[PDB]
Each structure stands twice: as structure tokens, then as C-alpha cells.
């Protein structure tokens, strides 16, 4: 039906633009830039202009938070189209701010909020419409009080907008439009989508679970390092679904004697029961319910048991979802993670560069920036930053922007024009990057890598084999069932140092857009020296929760070398950490699409048990890079560096016969550093590109890292493992 649509979140941040689809417009006969009168629930309605985009489905309309709240509806609700009958332009339109959103800032609101928002933008306005505008490092809401030319109008440049004063009191059943929402979360698409899925039916459709009886998820546990926005995500979900958000703070619960703690837990659960669909959020769950063995007080044990029995009592269809955030997935009572109490677990995790960019764009939307703030350069060099680190960085830059113009124009309830006249310059961000101190620097990176097959030259057979083991079971799961045969879940790269094993693993992960986890030799040696091989389990857990994933074990022979050679020190090839890796590999399913890649420069000293079937059964030799791979190395290292066009990198890759990838990396690490040095000397004497002479000067110090004997040994190993037997003449008779 043309008068029945479903609400979705708007991609853009436009105040009064709704996105639809061309097939929907086909049955509506509407233009690209016309206006319609959308009628919402509770008799309310608004006027908005439509837009065309292909992201939404045929019968889905995208609306932003402010227009969605104007219609008194939420995501997924039913909204008609009802095109507006072309109401003429407005004349006076009186608008006033809301008292709560204007408190603290006073002055003339025309040149700062009203005029820039209404400049060169014909935005429809109704009597009951309230609109939010971002400026002066704030988000302020304005409500229209009256409109002389009919209740509907369209803002014209000559319209004399009036703002007398006396801000209106906040209404009864209208919520703040800038507190929390899905658009306040940065790049948590997978996790936020998971939470939306688990939470949609229990809360948006409560009577369904009083009439069907299927058990919905009752306990969701958000876990991840601190500062990743778990509380923010829970608040956003509760606000968007409209369910009553009850917040339980771990420290606040545990700061109240030995009485009121239990009373407060019980009262929170009863209040959530008495108040319709609700989300109970228990922030810092490990403060309330840690491992009951490590507790050394009776009241703590009673707190944990009371939480357990409250969670068990929330097995009925009371429409109360209990959410909990912890930084300790393994330091909360295991009895909480059982079925019926906290069944679902969501790992928030570190934001990637895209997520960091999204968070930075969210935190800087109200702030007036400059033109030089890239906001993507910082997002690429904020490694190890959780969203809280990024918020701290943004606030630090903004504060230093205020620390440069601090007492020039006095900020004595201060005027709006001076507030709007601020700017943050990119060098402030580059300053804060050196004063950042990321919290999650020492955290396992789980991200789809940016290495593609372009960054790798040659290795055509290796690329083919890798995509046979990874790309086929992922992108063609129809096979491996028709033929009834599981994909191999592991491969062992072997070859000389510096030949692209890491890049091959990253590129195969990126081709399937799979997560990539790298476990380097120092980490295996850390587990071996400290006898903390139990952490191997955790690594595989991270791989399983991040599926599809490539779990890469670089220099898998590190422990074997640390023990000596092939024998080692008296003992055999088995060690505790590689034994744990074997155990964890046997415990995977091949249906998780977790692929293990081990790399070793010394396949001779590797434990043979890891080469057995059901393990890294395929061995791939990664040889010394051929000339095409050398050209790729040179191009990849030289990209991001201004290099002269006359350099014959193809020629450069011809006498680098037995050179490894690290050899050419050092070749530019020297030529390009000579260029830097020449720049500095010429700048000293005076006060653009890596020339051919720089590359000749660097090649004058070119040495092969891997000797001929080592290459001979690698070739011998490859022969004895790949030359097979004399079965090349086999043929079925007739």
C-alpha cells in the first residue's frame, strides 16, 4: 500500500530529508525534490521533502531522529506518505528554543542557529514541529509556536523569522532529541545489529511473547575493554526501542552497606517488571558478581546469589531484557553465563580505522572545525584507541583551541556569537596524538586487513592455493556439501625470511573480508617462558567469536628455536604451547570458517604432529620473491613516497636476483632516507622526489639476507615434501 511504510535510520545527518526508493515513488508519482505530509502515531504529523536512494528497500523509508520523534514513532513503525497539497510559502513563522536545551547559552539566536539553518534551504515547517540544529559545539532544539499562513508552510528567504524569547518548558511525553541514539555510535555495525536483532522482538513486540511462548533472549552480556561504549550502546538501544532503561551501577550497588544492596537489586528488577517492556542495564557487572571463589565476604556472595535468583525469576514473559557490561568475560560468576541468565554474549572490541573515523565524525559534529582537519589522517594514526580515547583526544584538541584564544574576547550566560566563533586546527590533533596514551594499545587486533593481492607480486600458484583453501569454502559453501567433504582448516607456510607469508595471509583474509588475528613468535615465547599456555585457548576463542577469521601463527618455530634445533634440549619436538595449539585445532568445527595459517622459516624443526590431517596438513613453500614480486615490493614501499618517474623499478628488480622482500624494503629504507637527509642538508644550506641517484646510492649498500645454502636447504625440503613418487604415469585401464 502506498500509505504504509516502515521506518529506518537515516544514512545522512540532514534535519528534514527523508530517503525513499524509486519503486516506491513509481506508485506515488512524486518528484525528487517535492514535499509530503507524513502522518505519525498519536494524531501527530509533519511535513518533509523526500529523497531517492538505493540503499533502502522498496517499501522502506529512512528518517532521522528529529523527524522520527516529530511523528511520535520509532524504527520499524508504520508511517503513511500522504503527499502535501503544495502549501504556499510562509510569512512570519514564530519559533522559540526549549528551556532545557538553551540553559547556559544566551544571546541572539538568529545569526548562529536560525539563519544558517534556514539559509538556502527550503525546509517545510508545521505548528508542532521541533527541530534540532548543531552549532557552537552544542545541539539546540527549537519549537514553532505559531504559523500565520496555515499550519503547514515552507521556509522562504524573505520570511521574517521571529524569536522573541521566553523559552517553552519541556513537554510531558517528548524526550530529548540529542541524548543517545544509534547515530551516536561509531562503526559498531555488527555488534549493534546483533543487539538490535536480539532486542527487537522482546521489546517492540511484547504481546507476541504472551501469545506464542518461544523463549526470547533474557540476558545479554556486552564485554570488551573499557571505554568501548557498552553503556552508550545499551542506552542507544533502549532509547531507540522506547523501552524503559533502568541502569544498575556496580560500584553504586556495592557502595551500600550489606542491606540496601540486595534491596536495590530487587527493587530495580521489580521496577523493571512494573514498567512494561524494559532493559535492565547492569554496568560494571564484575563489580557486583565476580568469581564467587575470589570473594571474601558474605554480603558479596549474597549479592551474587540474589542476582542469580532475580535473573532466574526473569525467565517469565515479563518483557524485561537484562543487559550487562563487563570488562571481565572471565571474571564474572560462570553461573551467570548459564542458560536463562546471561545467554547471549556480544564482544564490542577495539574500533578499526573506519570505526575510529566514525567516532571522530560523531564527536566533532557539534564542534566547529577548520578546513585542514583531515579527521581521517588522525583516524588512521589512532591505533590502539577505544572510543573513549578518541573522545579524550577530541576534547583535548578543542580545549587547546580554547587555550589559544582564552582571554582575548572575554567569556564572562555568555553570548552565542562568540561561541560559534571557534575552530580546531589539524596541528592540535597532531599534538594530541603524541600526548594520546591509548588505553588499548596492548590489545589483540582483530580487523580485516588492508593488504590485497595487488600488494603481492607473483606467487600465482600460492595465491591460487590460498584461495582454494579459504575463498572456496567461504564463497562457495554449496560445494563441500555436494561432494560431502570438509575444507581443510589449516595451512603451513614455509620458506626463507622475508618472502611474503604475512602479506599472503593478510591478502587472503582481505579477499574474503575475514578478520585477521596475528600471533607472533614473541607471544608464543611469552606463553612458553611463563608456562601460560592456557592463553592459547583464549586466542582460539577470539578467533571463533570473530569468525570468519584467519588465525595466523607467524614464526611458529619460535619455541623450537628457543629450545635449540630439531631435537632442542634433550626432549622431542613437542612443547606445551604448540601442544595447546594442537588441542585447540582438534576442537574446532570447520563450520566456523576459522582458518589457521602457520608460518615458519624452519619447517625441519616444526613438530610433525601439527602437519597431520585435521591440522596444518597442506604445506606451501613461499620462495624468494621473483622479479614481479620484487616490483610489487618496491611499488608498495615506495607508494606514499614521492618517487621520480625516471626510476626503472623494473630494471631495479633484475639484479636483485636472490633478494628477499626485506632486502628491497631496506633498499628504499636507505634510498628514501638518503633523500630525507639530502632534503635536510639542502634546507640548512638554503635557509622533492626519490631520485635515481638516491636509489643507486642505496643499491651500493645492497646485501642479500638469505644465503645460497639456506635457499638450497629450502629447495631440498620442498622437493622431499612435494616431488611425491613415480605415480605420474598412472592411468585406469581402458
457 counts as binding ligand ATP under rule CB under 6 A: yes
Nearer to ligand ADP, 186 or 500 (CB): 186
Binding partner of 115, given ligand ADP, Mg ion, a copy of itself, none, CB within 5-8 angstroms per partner class: none
Nearer to K ion, 366 or 377 (CB): 366
CB 322 within 8 A of CB 311: yes
CB 298 within 8 A of CB 273: no
242 counts as binding a copy of itself under rule CB under 8 A: no
Nearer to ligand ATP, 121 or 662 (CB): 662
Determine if residue 500 is labeled as part of a ligand binding site.
yes
Determine if residue 501 is labeled as part of a ligand binding site.
yes
Q: What minimum distance in Å lies between the beta carbon of 217 and ligand ATP?
A: 41
Q: For residue 352, give the nearest of 309, 308, 384, 307 by alpha carbon.
A: 384
Residue with cell 557539534: 366
Binding partner of 188, given K ion, ligand ADP, ligand ATP, none, CB within 5-8 angstroms per partner class: ligand ADP
Determine if residue 384 is labeled as part of a ligand binding site.
no
- Which residues, numbered 547-566, are part of the site for ligand ATP (CB under 6 A)? 555
231 counts as binding K ion under rule CB under 5 A: yes
712 counts as binding a copy of itself under rule CB under 8 A: no
Q: Tell which phi-psi region holds residue 186, choosing left (phi > 0), alpha (psi between -120 and 50) or beta.
A: beta
Q: What minimum distance in Å lies between the beta carbon of 428 and ligand ADP?
A: 19
Nearer to ligand ATP, 375 or 702 (CB): 702
CB 83 within 8 A of CB 386: no
Q: What minimum distance in Å lies between the beta carbon of 705 and ligand ATP?
A: 8
Nearer to K ion, 308 or 388 (CB): 388
Q: What minimum distance in Å lies between the beta carbon of 553 and ligand ATP?
A: 11
- Which residues, numbered 615-644, are part of the site for ligand ATP (CB under 6 A)? 622, 625, 629, 632-633, 636-637
Centre a 10 Å sphere on the Cβ of residue 485 and count the other Cβ atoms it contains: 9
120: CB partners within 8 A, 6+ apart: 157
Residue with cell 555488534: 191
From 290, 498, 548, 598, residue interacting with ligand ATP (rule: CB under 6 A): 498
327 counts as binding K ion under rule CB under 5 A: no
Chain gaps in the chain, named by the residue before each (C–N > 2.5 Å): 412, 687
218: CB partners within 8 A, 6+ apart: 311, 314, 315, 320, 321, 322, 340, 341, 343
C-alpha 62/C-alpha 514 separation (Å) is: 29
C-alpha 71/C-alpha 40 separation (Å) is: 4
249 counts as binding K ion under rule CB under 5 A: no
* Positions in the binding site for ligand ADP (CB under 6 A): 185-186, 188, 226-232, 325, 359, 362, 387-388, 391
For the stretch 202-207, contacts whose Cβ atoms lie closer than 8 Å and that sit 24 or more positions apart, written own/partner, are 202/277, 202/319, 202/321, 203/241, 203/242, 203/243, 203/277, 203/279, 203/319, 203/321, 204/74, 204/76, 204/241, 204/242, 204/277, 206/276, 206/277, 206/319
518 counts as binding ligand ATP under rule CB under 6 A: no
Which one of 11-19, 209-217, 230-238, 329-337 is the stretch in contact with Mg ion (CB under 5 A)? Answer: 230-238
Burial of 494 (0-12, 13-18, 19+ CB in 10 A): buried
Cell of 120: 538556502
Binding partner of 231, given Mg ion, a copy of itself, ligand ATP, none, CB within 5-8 angstroms per partner class: Mg ion
C-alpha 472/C-alpha 656 separation (Å) is: 35
CB 57 within 8 A of CB 90: no
Nearer to a copy of itself, 189 or 476 (CB): 189
From 290, 500, 548, 603, residue interacting with ligand ATP (rule: CB under 6 A): 500
Nearer to Mg ion, 199 or 599 (CB): 599
Task: Give the β-pairing of 594-600 and 549-553.
Answer: parallel
- Map residues 314-353 to x or -, x wherever contact with a copy of itself holds by CB under 8 A: ----------------------------------------
The three-state secondary structure class of 99 is helix
Q: What minimum distance in Å lies between the beta carbon of 658 and ligand ATP?
A: 13
Determine if residue 241 is labeled as part of a ligand binding site.
no
Q: Tell which phi-psi region holds residue 47, choosing left (phi > 0), alpha (psi between -120 and 50) or beta.
A: beta
C-alpha 268/C-alpha 324 separation (Å) is: 14
Nearer to ligand ATP, 237 or 599 (CB): 599
Nearer to K ion, 327 or 532 (CB): 327
Nearer to ligand ADP, 160 or 399 (CB): 399
Determine if residue 231 is labeled as part of a ligand binding site.
yes
C-alpha 647/C-alpha 671 separation (Å) is: 12
Determine if residue 163 is labeled as part of a ligand binding site.
no
Q: What minimum distance in Å lies between the beta carbon of 212 and a copy of itself?
A: 5
- Which residues, numbered 442-501, are part of the site for a copy of itself (CB under 8 A)? none
What is the helix (H) or strand (E) element at residue 47, kind and residue range?
Answer: strand 45-52
Nearer to a copy of itself, 1 or 169 (CB): 1
Q: What minimum distance in Å lies between the beta carbon of 363 and ligand ADP?
A: 7
Alpha helix (H) ranges present in 314-386?
353-363, 377-380
Q: For residue 174, give the nearest of 61, 71, 76, 62 by alpha carbon.
A: 71
| Gap between the terminal Cα atoms of the chain | 67
Q: For residue 383, give the nearest of 350, 360, 359, 347 by alpha carbon.
A: 350
Residue with cell 615506495: 638
In sequence order, the β-bridge partners of residue 191 are none
Q: How crowded is the C-beta side of 156, counted as CA atoms within 13 Å? A: 12
159: CB partners within 8 A, 6+ apart: 89, 90, 91, 92, 93, 118
Cell of 60: 522502506
Nearer to ligand ATP, 408 or 655 (CB): 655
Binding partner of 459, given a copy of itself, ligand ADP, ligand ATP, none, CB within 5-8 angstroms per partner class: ligand ATP
501 counts as binding Mg ion under rule CB under 5 A: yes
- Which residues, numbered 369-398, are part of the site for a copy of itself (CB under 8 A)? 391, 395, 398
633 counts as binding Mg ion under rule CB under 5 A: no
Which one of 206-214, 467-475, 536-544, 725-733 is the stretch in contact with a copy of itself (CB under 8 A)? Answer: 206-214
From 412, 569, 683, 708, residue interacting with a copy of itself (rule: CB under 8 A): 412
Q: What minimum distance in Å lies between the beta carbon of 209 and ligand ADP?
A: 15
Q: What are phi and psi of 477, to 5 degrees?
A: -70, -10
Binding partner of 191, given Mg ion, ligand ADP, K ion, none, CB within 5-8 angstroms per partner class: none
Which one of 214-222, 299-307, 578-586, 652-660 is the stretch in contact with a copy of itself (CB under 8 A)? Answer: 214-222
Cell of 395: 576534547
Diameter of the chain measured on Cα atoms = 100
In sequence order, the β-bridge partners of residue 282 are 248, 324
CB 528 within 8 A of CB 581: no
Binding partner of 167, given K ion, Mg ion, ligand ATP, none, CB within 5-8 angstroms per partner class: none
Q: What minimum distance in Å lies between the beta carbon of 537 and a copy of itself?
A: 35
- Which residues, numbered 649-708, are part of the site for ligand ATP (CB under 6 A)? 661-662, 665
599 counts as binding ligand ATP under rule CB under 6 A: yes
Burial of 497 (0-12, 13-18, 19+ CB in 10 A): middle
Determine if residue 205 is labeled as part of a ligand binding site.
no
Binding footprint of ligand ATP on the chain (CB under 6 A): 455-459, 495, 497-503, 555, 599, 601, 622, 625, 629, 632-633, 636-637, 661-662, 665
Which residue numbers belong to the known binding site?
226-232, 327, 363, 498-503
Binding footprint of a copy of itself on the chain (CB under 8 A): 6, 76, 78, 104-105, 136-138, 197, 200-201, 205, 207-208, 210-216, 366, 391, 395, 398-399, 402-403, 406-407, 410-414, 419
Binding footprint of K ion on the chain (CB under 5 A): 231
Which residue numbers belong to the known binding site for ATP?
226-232, 327, 363, 498-503
Amino acid at each position: 500500500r502506498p500509505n504504509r511504510l516502515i521506518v529506518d535510520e537515516a544514512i545522512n545527518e540532514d534535519n528534514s530529508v527523508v530517503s525513499l526508493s524509486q519503486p516506491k515513488m513509481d506508485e506515488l508519482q512524486l518528484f525528487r525534490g517535492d514535499t509530503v505530509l507524513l502522518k505519525g502515531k498519536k494524531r501527530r504529523e509533519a511535513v518533509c521533502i523526500v529523497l531517492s536512494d538505493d540503499t533502502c528497500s522498496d517499501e522502506k523509508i529512512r528518517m532521522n531522529r528529529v523527524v522520527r520523534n516529530n511523528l511520535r514513532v520509532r524504527l520499524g513503525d508504520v508511517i503513511s506518505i500522504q503527499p502535501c497539497p503544495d502549501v504556499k510559502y510562509g510569512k512570519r513563522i514564530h519559533v522559540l528554543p526549549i528551556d532545557d536545551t538553551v540553559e547556559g547559552i544566551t544571546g541572539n539566536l538568529f545569526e548562529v542557529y536560525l539563519k544558517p539553518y534556514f539559509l538556502e534551504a527550503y525546509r517545510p515547517i508545521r505548528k508542532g514541529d521541533i527541530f534540532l540544529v548543531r552549532g557552537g559545539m552544542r545541539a539546540v532544539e527549537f519549537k514553532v509556536v505559531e504559523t500565520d499562513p496555515s499550519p503547514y508552510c515552507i521556509v522562504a528567504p524573505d520570511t521574517v523569522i521571529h524569536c522573541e524569547g521566553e523559552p517553552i518548558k519541556r513537554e510531558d511525553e517528548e524526550e530529548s532529541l540529542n541524548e543517545v541514539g544509534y547515530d551516536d555510535i561509531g562503526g559498531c555495525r555488527k555488534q549493534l545489529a546483533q543487539i538490535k536483532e536480539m532486542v527487537e522482538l522482546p521489546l517492540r513486540h511484547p504481546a507476541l511473547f504472551k501469545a506464542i511462548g518461544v523463549k526470547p533472549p533474557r540476558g545479554i552480556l556486552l564485554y570488551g575493554p573499557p571505554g568501548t561504549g557498552k553503556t552508550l550502546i545499551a542506552r542507544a538501544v533502549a532509547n531507540e526501542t522506547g523501552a524503559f532503561f533502568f541502569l544498575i551501577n556496580g560500584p553504586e550497588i556495592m557502595s551500600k552497606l550489606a542491606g540496601e544492596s540486595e534491596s536495590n537489586l530487587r527493587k530495580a528488577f521489580e521496577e523493571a517488571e512494573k514498567n512494561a517492556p524494559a532493559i535492565i542495564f547492569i554496568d560494571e557487572l564484575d563489580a557486583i558478581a565476580p568469581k564467587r571463589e575470589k570473594t571474601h565476604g558474605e554480603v558479596e556472595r549474597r549479592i551474587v546469589s540474589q542476582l542469580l535468583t532475580l535473573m532466574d525469576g526473569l525467565k517469565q514473559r515479563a518483557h524485561v531484557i537484562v543487559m550487562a557490561a563487563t570488562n571481565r568475560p572471565n571474571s564474572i560468576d560462570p553461573a551467570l553465563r548459564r542458560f536463562g541468565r546471561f545467554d547471549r554474549e556480544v564482544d564490542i572490541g577495539i574500533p578499526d580505522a573506519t570505526g575510529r573515523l566514525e567516532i571522530l565524525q560523531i564527536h566533532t559534529k557539534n564542534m566547529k572545525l577548520a578546513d585542514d582537519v583531515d579527521l581521517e589522517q588522525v583516524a588512521n594514526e589512532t591505533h590502539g584507541h577505544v572510543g573513549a580515547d578518541l573522545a579524550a583526544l577530541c576534547s583535548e584538541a578543542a580545549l587547546q583551541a580554547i587555550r589559544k584564544k582564552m582571554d582575548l574576547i572575554d567569556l564572562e550566560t555568555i553570548d552565542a556569537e562568540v561561541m560559534n566563533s571557534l575552530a580546531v586546527t589539524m596541528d592540535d590533533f597532531r599534538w594530541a596524538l603524541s600526548q594520546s596514551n591509548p588505553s588499548a594499545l596492548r590489545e589483540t587486533v582483530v580487523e580485516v586487513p588492508q593488504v590485497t593481492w595487488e600488494d603481492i607480486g607473483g606467487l600465482e600458484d600460492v595465491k591460487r592455493e590460498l584461495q582454494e583453501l579459504v575463498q572456496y569454502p567461504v564463497e562457495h559453501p554449496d560445494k563441500f556439501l555436494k561432494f560431502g567433504m570438509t575444507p581443510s582448516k589449516g595451512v603451513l607456510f614455509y620458506g626463507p625470511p622475508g618472502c611474503g607469508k604475512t602479506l599472503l595471509a593478510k591478502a587472503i583474509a582481505n579477499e574474503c573480508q575475514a578478520n585477521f588475528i596475528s600471533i607472533k613468535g614473541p607471544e608464543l615465547l611469552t606463553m612458553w617462558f611463563g608456562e601460560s599456555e592456557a592463553n592459547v585457548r583464549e586466542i582460539f576463542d577470539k578467533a571463533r567469536q570473530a569468525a570468519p577469521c584467519v588465525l595466523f601463527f607467524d614464526e611458529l618455530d619460535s619455541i623450537a628455536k628457543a629450545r635449540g634445533g630439531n631435537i632442542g634440549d634433550g626432549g622431542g619436538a613437542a612443547d606445551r604451547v604448540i601442544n595447546q595449539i594442537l588441542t585447540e585445532m582438534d576442537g574446532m568445527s570447520t563450520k566456523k570458517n576459522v582458518f589457521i595459517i602457520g608460518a615458519t622459516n624452519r619447517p625441519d624443526i616444526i613438530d610433525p604432529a601439527i602437519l597431520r590431517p585435521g591440522r596444518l596438513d597442506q604445506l606451501i613453500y613461499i620462495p624468494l620473491p621473483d622479479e614481479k614480486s620484487r616490483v610489487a615490493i618496491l611499488k608498495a614501499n615506495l607508494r606514499k613516497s614521492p618517487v621520480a618517474k625516471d626510476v626503472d623499478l623494473e630494471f631495479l628488480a633484475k639484479m636483485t636476483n636472490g633478494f628477499s622482500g626485506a632486502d628491497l624494503t631496506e633498499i628504499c629504507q636507505r634510498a628514501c632516507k638518503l633523500a630525507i637527509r639530502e632534503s635536510i642538508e639542502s634546507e640548512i644550506r638554503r635557509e622533492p622526489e626519490i631520485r635515481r641517484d638516491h636509489f643507486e646510492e642505496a643499491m651500493r649498500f645492497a646485501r642479500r639476507s638469505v644465503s645460497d645454502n639456506d635457499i638450497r636447504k629450502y629447495e631440498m625440503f620442498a622437493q622431499t615434501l612435494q616431488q611425491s613418487r613415480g605415480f605420474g604415469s598412472f592411468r585406469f585401464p581402458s
